[PDB]
């Protein structure tokens, strides 16, 4: 009879409980205290204008209907008690295809404190949208957002809040970085009020500041382009009595410029504007073509 008391506590706790009604439905506003622990900042896809993130998402609020009194002061319950109580319906405003992991059991955490405070934690992978401006590609810096709030509960019903100081709420782990191409500089949280066709909602925004690393595009594209330009400029030191030599020089370096440019266009998305690499490739191609026409003139 050591676990019968806890079964009685849990049964009495949910006896007369409506999980369709938020705490304080016509009496108060539900204040949800949010916290995010980023366990890994996943890869940022530039062709889809998206990024991946893996988070422990914690939400705390206070339900006066879940007050108890027993031999324990905190009930660390399963992930099936959360489906029998009211939990907030947080969604990600700019999410594409997120996953809430349930291996091997639903990765959810529910803790009820004897005064009625609940801590509800989830482990989930979010695939969010990051609208990028690629004018300065590949020397660009972005602020990838992550906006969340409540679906269907307006500002007069559910308001969000950070559990600690806003500069210390969204916490990224140190070894948690799956970034190959970027560099996570810092985080930046924000709070606002969005307005949609159903009312005004509270939105908690997080910005992750990324700075692309250039060391790949340098060796891949910028150094072959400069090498091809130098190899085209080599031709100016050959004697004009040998026309096929300089002819095959010019035309074959133009062909290589074409090969590098075609190879080079698979890196970036199909943006309609010119990036910085596009300007560099255009000027280098112009130099190669100018060298060849100069040979034609001589």
């Amino acid at each position, epitope marked *: 009879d050591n676990t019968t008391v806890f079964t009685r506590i849990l049964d009495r706790l949910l006896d007369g409980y409506d999980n369709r009604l938020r705490p304080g439905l016509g009496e108060r506003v539900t204040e949800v205290k949010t916290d995010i622990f980023v366990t890994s900042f996943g890869p940022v896809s530039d062709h889809d204008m998206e990024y991946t993130i893996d988070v422990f998402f914690r939400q705390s609020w206070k339900d006066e209907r879940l007050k108890f009194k027993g031999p324990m002061t905190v009930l660390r319950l399963n992930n099936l008690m959360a489906s029998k109580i009211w939990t907030p319906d947080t969604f990600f405003h700019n999410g594409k295809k997120s996953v809430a992991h349930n291996m091997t059991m639903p990765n959810k955490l529910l803790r009820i404190t004897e005064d009625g405070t609940l801590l509800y934690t989830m482990r989930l992978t979010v695939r969010a949208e990051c609208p990028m401006h690629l004018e300065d590609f590949p020397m660009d810096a972005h602020a990838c957002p992550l906006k969340f709030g409540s679906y269907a509960y307006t500002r007069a019903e559910v308001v969000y809040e950070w559990t600690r100081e*806003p500069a210390r709420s969204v916490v990224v782990a140190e070894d948690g970085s799956r970034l190959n191409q970027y560099d996570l500089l810092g985080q930046t*949280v924000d709070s606002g009020i969005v307005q949609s066709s159903t009312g005004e909602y509270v939105v908690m925004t997080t910005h992750f500041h990324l700075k692309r690393k250039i060391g790949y595009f340098v060796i891949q594209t910028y150094l072959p382009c400069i090498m091809t330009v130098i190899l085209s400029q080599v031709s100016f030191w050959l004697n004009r009595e040998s026309v096929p030599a300089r002819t095959v020089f010019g035309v074959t370096t133009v062909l290589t410029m074409t090969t590098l440019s075609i190879s080079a266009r698979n890196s970036l998305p199909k943006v309609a504007y010119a990036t910085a690499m596009d300007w560099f490739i255009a000027v280098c191609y112009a130099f190669v073509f100018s060298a060849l026409i100069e040979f034609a003139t001589v």
Partner: antibody
Amino acid sequence: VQLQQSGAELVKPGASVKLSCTASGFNIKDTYMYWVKQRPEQGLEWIGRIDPANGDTKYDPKFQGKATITTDTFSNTAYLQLSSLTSEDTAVYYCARKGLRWAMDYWGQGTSVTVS
Amino acid sequence: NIVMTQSPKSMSMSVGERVTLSCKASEYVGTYVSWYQQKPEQSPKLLIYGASNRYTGVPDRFTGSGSATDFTLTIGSVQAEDLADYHCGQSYSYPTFGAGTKLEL
């Protein structure tokens, strides 16, 4: 809804004082509790922060090691203990409650601490 | 430690006109800047929270305008009881206040 602080008093240079702040109308285990210090005709300066539900505290680097904030949830009170006092501690100390987008909406009445 | 620089330190004006106070941050504080009003020998009272959010019990003549670094409090059609000290304080990190701004008639 209401924060009740203690009464003004004097203290000898080099002693220690313990100021109290009794809350009525809410539970201190729900919000954070801030201690703010104001000098005569100067700006406010934040001393420290306590989370009464968990118990962890933070302090301003200027007040780190000099002040110690503690709480008592039974009597719904928050305490600020100052040690190794000096003459530049003559100020008015406020006890504030966090709430509504980190704003410190509810303040106390302020206690005048004078060092003679 | 985020520093808040408020400007100006003092302002003399008559009754009824529009007045504007400015506050600047060293680091980023994203709409977590509160505006308090403190009368002499009293405790500060919250006027504006967030960056533009009137506290429940404040008149409509106070309005806040926010950014990432530059914040301002504008009072249109001031009255005879709006003379006090005004502090801007950030809450994005551990809270730090500004130097203050006396407002006299």
